[PDB]
Ligand binder design. Structure first.
Ligand code: ADP
Ligand code: ADP
Ligand code: ADP
Lengths: 508, 485, 483
């Protein structure tokens, strides 16, 4: 009776908050932390995750929306807007009776019809560079500056096209994004291979290593001593001061074992013996091995080690011995880069060329994070587009066509479910309206123009988000993901139904 | 206070201008009147809006008074005057906060007014006079969009004949016109087609018993304010009247049957219970003279007037027809119908067209309406301010940028966006030199007004602009209100 | 959004007055309760507790401008403030924020290519101390008072022209040392790092020496304890005096026994080490900090060239000159009545030397004093009519935003802003680009800067315009956040 009205109001409020973000012309929002940190972004997922929402059912809507969006690529803001408009349209009739079950049945019938229509609307255009360029542009201009998006499109599409060679759905592990704080953000491209986070304090070991072999195995040049005897330097100081010794002998034994491996499998002092350790190593033994051509490195995290295993190879353990060279891997170029004060290890031209990283050089922290999230969203969008092999027109287009199909299908259904069908159609109308509003044009004028142009053309037509006139998305190059639309319809119907079915609020 | 009083005056001006800012154009929005009894009034006219509302600030009262004085002087345009004055006084806020004196603002406003006058007189399209073609075109342009569209076929020719009935040839060529001297005869009953015209004064009063020589083939009217009595024991005044031998002598007192016989002994026809608004037009159309002092009595006491008199009792009521008057400056116009609810409005719009005609005699010019003239003069000023320098250039430009409020509100109360349309209108009005386009008031779309067919008299536009500028300078010249509260 | 624009307006207003050579210096009290009087805008922003996240963006933009060019910060502030004011009025008209953003970007793109067309570049080179100092005059003229600029320019230039090698310069090379006392005129140019000392047992002719760095500053039973303390101290001074050590520094005070043992080794005892001096020494000679006395070693020890006492400045100072490059480091000695005006002069010297560094990589000079701002405003507002559509409003507002710089530079100099702006704009049609705003006359008169030599760098103006436009755009694209 009243809990339904409360839920309607909260969903409408959330829709109003999120309204001015849909579309590439949408205005970004600023997230200031309690500590003082500031985050400026527009992606629906991060807004719903990081917002300090007050209304409880609004928090529920956000939680379920982000949970379902984690499955597909994106489309969260459109989903929230559609849920809000669905609820408003339903309430418009519930105010005059209309037990919500009737509206729910109308919603499910309209969902079935819309899924069918989307099945007959999808475009099965083949694989090529240009369509995926357009997909990346569509997915990127909705998240970041226009020119920066144009820059990022080439890198993202080339990376995904390179990874596509396996002819299986693969991502995430095989593409990594590195973080660094260069002043010039223009430097952004693909780095085929692997880039380590940081190197070590070493005076001119090799610079251009060129061909080399990788074994890792967490070299113990700073092997764990016997420092821990009893708490700290107690009255029995000779323990932690003298018994702490006799472990440097283990370090030297490891040094000779590395020497044996190097001049056993390498055959000479060249052909760098690339090894990485998770903890520190003494500079003395470091330079001693460096003079022998051994590429010794230290203080790396796990993820780079498992990345190296699947790319180059090598066991990982702090305490080791002269193991077999079976786990050893080889890299074409192990060039090390340095920019000002921080050093980069470019492990390039390795075996298994699947592992590829991307370079970003944003000036500050928040721009870096925004670029990272935009790149991730673009990668997910292109991955989805390749996986389904079918794309649908954007800029609305499908929304208005589904609306026309539902409206002409309204008399077909029996009972009062026509009310639910009409509400569902008017709810799907929200997306082109929100695009037109965010562009700066008039809601109803643009909507009428789009619908009228679609009337006698038949072909999908959408909003041109620079002049407001109708445009055919196929020719311009605006594309959406078919799986995104499927998940959108399913999730919006499910959440709207669940909110509508409630009748009472009680504490617990 | 200092500039605080200036800001208060122009704030009152702004808050009274936007009250009626929405009710102009062919799609004026309605207003709500809530009297403290509960009644509610539908209103489209901003004049009645200002008349009914009550204000407390002297600036608002002065502006309302100037709007009225413009209303009964030139006719229409009161809403435009108020809007323009409010807009200029509002854009003066920016400069009055620059700590820069009102005097230089005033000088800039006066220069802007002079340049606007020049550019209106330059852009005005000519019209012919005594030609029904573009007279009816003006009827279609301005006399339309009123309650006359059903009765335009009669209003048009009524005005077109009425244009030549109130002329004074004093100093030039028919440049003098007077407004109330037209003998209006508004009487309901019968069909509206019975409304006609006549050259002469039409007097609704008549003698009680017209059994005497009322009509003479050369009425030499003599006016007298004296009262006619029985006899001397005053026949002495009648005897003195006999000296100059007139045929009609007009008084303003009742006449008895024996008084009637005493008058017809001198063969003079008197009248009673007549109005001063009738006596003055009788004298104007007849060129008579009033005198009763014996010393001043000379041969000049009798002035020949009409040449034919007639009395007709159309519908058992006492009319008096005085046709073929010596001076065709106060002549009869007839009005017929059922109710005076619209015929009054049709009449008033017809004398508005009459003023249009007399100004056409002065300046046969029309300015393109629908915001065309406003944007044309704004472009003229903005291109003119480029050459001129000095600290007063900013108000000079701001007046131009402020006068475009008329097309802005025409677009606003039509539905269409007021930003894109204004930008497009300016775009096709600067580089396009010889076009002077306007905005359609109905559909809210730009259209060349030479094609739509809307034009306004030059004189009314000039009067509106001048009154707006003078109101702005007057409200900027007031440095203190205080003589009490 | 109007809340953000209002906050940025307030933050621009609070530092608007300090712009120009007649900037009204403010009183500054920090959390540890000092009392500064400073006209430097960047210093004002440092002690402003700016909490509004919108104004934080403009502050970061100013920091980036200073971090890359080192001057024009307050120009960025005032330009962004004017841009936001005009964007706010455009929004109030009814224009969408997106259209304003597009217009601002187009106008900035136009200005970036208009700018290099009004340059009167440098004369011949960084050499010819008099000429190059004349170029470096305007920055110091503005940042500190306009009186002692003629001498401050020579002082700040004679030091920086020492090493114009391979066209590479570093700001940290030109260091500044404080010597209180006499007036500014007594300041001069010296070579090598300098600070105070205590002892006098110093040797002048020194080969590559050895620096010791101290990170940690300093009845028979009583006699035996005193002897034990004495012998322990002697052992420690012998241990620190080994390996041919010649100079020692410590952050503490002097002790008669400690200085006696130092002198008996023919070693002077240097004290009064500031909290900032040790890092500068370690980076300049490749030394390291030694916590206690007992671990001295030859390897953990930095090398100097010459150490001796200089009486210049009516006081005793130490000199560490002729480093590895033998000419890289070049200090400047400063003399002043107190330390409060010392900081103003050091900031003026920094704001001059960084302009010189900018000039090293760009010989282009632009007529300052509002000349270039009014020229850009005229060019952009003329281009505005050539562009029909919804972006003309934003382009015109960009021109009016350039109009703000001479406006502020006049109104903070006791001159009617509108009058001087109108006169400048009118003259600028015939009395072309090189004309600007005269400061000397109380009457609002104009004066040419090409003759007067009031010029500012091209790269600084270019980067400042770019950064200010970017800040305004990135602060216009924010809707709200709960606060
Ligand atoms: N160039 C364009 N012109 C018009 N509409 C566009 C354009 N690019 C994207 N869109 C629309 O923006 C919508 C996606 O925006 P948004 O919801 O912010 O992305 P997501 O939520 O998937 O991160 C799509 O429905 C698409 O129709
Ligand atoms: N058909 C039309 N299309 C566009 N504008 C019109 C039209 N008719 C009248 N106007 C505009 O209306 C304005 C005058 O109307 P208004 O001042 O409200 O009437 P009044 O003068 O009686 O107060 C003129 O500026 C004219 O441009
Ligand atoms: N003598 C002068 N006359 C007129 N203008 C000057 C004079 N000296 C400097 N200026 C102007 O004042 C400005 C001062 O900039 P400044 O406030 O120092 O920036 P920042 O503080 O960020 O370094 C310069 O851009 C310059 O154009």
């Amino acid at each position: 009776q009243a809990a339904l009205a409360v839920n309607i109001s909260a969903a409408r409020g959330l829709q109003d908050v999120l309204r001015t973000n849909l579309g590439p012309k949408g205005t970004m929002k600023m997230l200031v932390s309690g500590a003082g940190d500031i985050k400026l972004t527009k992606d629906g997922n991060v807004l719903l995750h990081e917002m300090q929402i007050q209304h409880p059912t609004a928090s529920l809507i956000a939680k379920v929306a982000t949970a379902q969006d984690d499955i597909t690529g994106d489309g969260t803001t459109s989903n929230v807007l559609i849920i809000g408009e669905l609820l408003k349209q339903a309430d418009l009739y519930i105010s005059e009776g209309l037990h919500p079950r009737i509206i729910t049945e109308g919603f499910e019938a309209a969902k079935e019809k819309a899924l069918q229509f989307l099945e007959e609307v999808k475009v099965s255009r083949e694989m090529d560079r240009e369509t995926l360029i357009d997909v990346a542009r569509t997915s990127l201009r909705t998240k970041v500056h226009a020119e920066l998006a144009d820059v990022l499109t080439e890198a993202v599409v080339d990376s995904i096209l390179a990874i596509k060679k396996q002819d299986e759905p693969i991502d995430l592990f095989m593409i990594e994004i590195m973080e660094m704080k260069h002043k010039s953000e223009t430097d952004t491209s693909l780095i085929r291979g692997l880039v380590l986070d940081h190197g070590a304090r070493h005076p001119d070991m090799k610079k251009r290593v060129e061909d080399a072999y990788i074994l890792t195995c967490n070299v113990s040049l700073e092997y764990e001593k016997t420092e821990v005897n009893s708490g700290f330097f107690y009255k029995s100081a000779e323990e932690r001061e003298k018994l702490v010794k006799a472990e440097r002998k283990f370090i030297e034994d490891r040094v000779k074992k590395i020497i044996e491996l190097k001049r056993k499998v390498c055959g000479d002092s060249d052909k760098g013996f690339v090894v990485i350790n998770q903890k520190g190593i003494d500079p003395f033994s470091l330079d001693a091995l460096s003079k022998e051509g051994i590429v010794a490195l230290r203080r790396a995290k796990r993820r780079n080690m498992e990345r190296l295993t699947l790319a180059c190879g090598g066991v990982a353990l702090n305490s080791f011995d002269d193991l077999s060279p079976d786990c050893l891997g080889h890299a074409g170029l192990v060039y090390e880069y340095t920019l000002g004060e921080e050093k980069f290890t470019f492990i390039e031209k390795c075996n298994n060329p699947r592992s590829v990283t991307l370079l970003i050089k944003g000036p500050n922290k928040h721009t870096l994070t925004q670029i990272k999230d935009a790149v991730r969203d673009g990668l997910r969008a292109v991955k989805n587009a390749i996986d389904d092999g079918c794309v649908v027109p954007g800029a609305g287009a499908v929304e208005v066509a589904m609306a026309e199909a539902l409206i002409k299908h309204k008399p077909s259904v029996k009972g009062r479910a026509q009310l639910g069908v009409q509400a569902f159609a008017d709810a799907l109308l929200i997306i082109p309206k929100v695009l037109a509003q965010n562009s700066g044009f008039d809601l109803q004028e643009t909507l009428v123009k789009i619908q009228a142009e679609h009337s006698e053309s038949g072909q999908l037509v959408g909003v041109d988000l620079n002049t407001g006139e109708p445009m055919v998305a196929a020719e311009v190059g605006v594309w959406d993901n078919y799986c995104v639309k499927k998940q959108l319809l399913h999730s919006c119907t499910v959440i709207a139904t669940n909110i509508l079915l409630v009748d009472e609020i009680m504490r617990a | 206070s200092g500039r605080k009083v200036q800001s208060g005056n122009i704030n009152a001006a702004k808050t009274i201008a936007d009250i009626i800012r929405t009710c102009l154009g062919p799609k004026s929005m309605m207003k709500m009147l809530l009297d403290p009894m509960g009644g509610i009034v539908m209103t489209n006219d901003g004049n009645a809006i200002l008349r009914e509302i009550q204000v407390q600030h002297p600036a608002a009262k002065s502006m309302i008074e100037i709007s009225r004085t413009q209303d009964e002087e030139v006719g229409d345009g009161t809403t435009s005057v108020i809007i323009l004055a409010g807009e200029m006084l509002s854009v003066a806020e920016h400069f009055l906060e620059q700590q820069m004196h009102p005097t230089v603002v005033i000088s800039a406003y006066r220069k802007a007014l002079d340049d606007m006058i020049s550019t209106l007189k330059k852009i005005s399209i000519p019209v012919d006079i005594s030609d029904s073609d573009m007279m009816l075109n003006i009827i279609n342009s301005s006399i339309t969009t009123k309650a006359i569209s059903r009765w335009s076929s009669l209003a048009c020719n009524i005005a077109l004949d009425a244009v030549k009935m109130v002329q004074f040839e004093e100093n030039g060529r028919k440049e003098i016109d007077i407004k109330k001297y037209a003998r209006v005869e508004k009487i309901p009953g019968g069909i509206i087609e019975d409304s006609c015209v006549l050259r002469g004064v039409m007097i609704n009063k008549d003698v009680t018993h017209p059994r005497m020589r009322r009509y003479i083939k050369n009425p030499r009217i003599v006016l007298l304010d004296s009262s006619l009595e029985y006899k001397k024991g005053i026949q002495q005044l009648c005897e003195d009247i006999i000296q100059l031998k007139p045929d009609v002598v007009i008084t303003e007192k009742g006449i008895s049957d024996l008084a009637q016989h005493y008058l017809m002994r001198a063969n003079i026809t008197a009248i009673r219970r007549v109005r001063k608004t009738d006596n003055n037009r009788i004298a104007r159309a007849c060129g008579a003279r009033i005198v009763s002092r014996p010393e001043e009595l000379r041969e000049d006491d009798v002035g020949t007037g009409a040449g034919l008199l007639e009395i007709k009792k159309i519908g058992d009521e006492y009319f008096t027809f005085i046709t073929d008057c010596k001076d065709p400056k106060a002549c009869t116009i007839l009005l017929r119908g059922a109710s005076k609810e619209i015929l009054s409005e049709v009449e008033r719009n017809l004398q508005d067209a009459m003023q249009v005609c007399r100004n056409v005699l002065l300046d046969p010019q029309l300015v393109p309406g629908g915001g065309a003239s406003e944007m044309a003069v704004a472009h003229a000023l903005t291109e003119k301010s480029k050459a001129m320098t000095g600290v007063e250039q900013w108000p000079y430009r701001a007046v131009a940028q402020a006068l475009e409020v008329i097309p802005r509100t025409l677009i606003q109360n039509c539905g269409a966006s007021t930003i894109r349309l204004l930008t497009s209108l300016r775009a096709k009005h600067t580089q396009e030199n010889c076009e002077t386009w306007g905005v359609n008031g109905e559909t809210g779309t730009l259209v060349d007004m030479k094609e739509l067919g809307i034009w306004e008299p030059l004189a009314v536009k000039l009067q509106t602009y001048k009154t707006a500028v003078e109101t702005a300078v007057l409200l900027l010249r007031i440095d203190d209100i205080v003589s009490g509260h | 959004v109007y809340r953000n624009i209002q906050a940025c307006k307030e933050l621009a207003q609070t530092t608007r007055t300090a712009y120009g050579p007649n900037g009204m210096n403010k009183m500054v009290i920090n959390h540890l309760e000092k009392l500064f009087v400073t006209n430097d805008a960047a210093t004002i922003l440092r002690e402003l507790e700016v909490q509004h996240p919108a104004a934080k963006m403009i502050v970061m933009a100013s920091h980036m401008q200073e971090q890359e060019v080192g001057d024009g910060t307050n120009f960025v502030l005032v330009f962004a403030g004017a841009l936001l004011e005009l964007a706010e009025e455009l929004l109030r008209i009814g224009l969408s924020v997106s259209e304003v953003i597009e217009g601002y970007e187009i106008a900035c793109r136009k200005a970036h290519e208009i700018l290099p067309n009004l340059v009167c570049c440098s004369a011949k080179n960084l050499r010819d101390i008099d000429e190059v100092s004349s170029l470096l005059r305007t920055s110091i003229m503005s940042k500190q008072y306009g009186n002692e600029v003629f001498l401050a320019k020579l002082i700040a230039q004679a030091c920086v022209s020492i090493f114009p090698d391979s066209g590479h310069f570093n700001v940290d090379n030109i260091r500044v040392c404080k010597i209180l006392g006499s007036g500014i005129s007594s300041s001069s140019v010296l070579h090598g790092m300098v600070f105070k000392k205590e002892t006098e047992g110093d040797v002048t002719s020194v080969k590559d020496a050895k620096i010791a760095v101290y990170s940690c500053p300093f009845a028979e039973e009583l006699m035996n304890f005193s002897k034990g303390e004495e012998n322990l101290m002697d052992a420690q001074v012998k241990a620190i005096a080994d390996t041919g050590a010649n100079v020692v520094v410590t952050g503490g005070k002097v002790a008669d026994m400690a200085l006696h043992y130092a002198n008996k080794y023919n070693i002077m005892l240097v004290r009064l080490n500031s909290k900032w001096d040790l890092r500068r020494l370690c980076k300049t000679v490749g030394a390291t900090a030694l916590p206690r006395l007992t671990p001295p070693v030859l390897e953990e020890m930095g090398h100097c060239d010459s150490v001796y006492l200089s009486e210049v400045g009516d006081t005793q100072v130490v000199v560490f000159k002729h480093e590895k490059e033998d000419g890289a480091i070049s200090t400047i000695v400063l003399r002043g009545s107190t330390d409060n005006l010392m900081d103003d002069i050091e900031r003026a010297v920094d704001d001059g030397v960084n302009t010189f560094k900018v000039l090293t990589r760009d010989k282009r000079l632009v007529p300052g004093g509002g000349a270039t701002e009014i020229e850009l405003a005229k060019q952009i507002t003329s281009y505005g009519e050539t562009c029909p559509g919804l972006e003309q409003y934003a382009i015109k507002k960009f021109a009016e935003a350039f109009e703000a710089i001479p406006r502020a530079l006049a109104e903070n100099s006791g001159v009617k802003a509108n009058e001087v702006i109108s006169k400048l704009y009118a003259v600028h049609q015939e009395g072309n680009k090189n004309v600007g705003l005269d400061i000397e006359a109380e009457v609002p008169a104009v004066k040419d800067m090409l003759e007067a030599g009031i010029l500012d760098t091209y790269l600084g103006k270019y980067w400042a315009i770019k950064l200010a436009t970017n800040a305004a755009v990135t602060v216009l694209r924010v809707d709200q956040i709960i606060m």
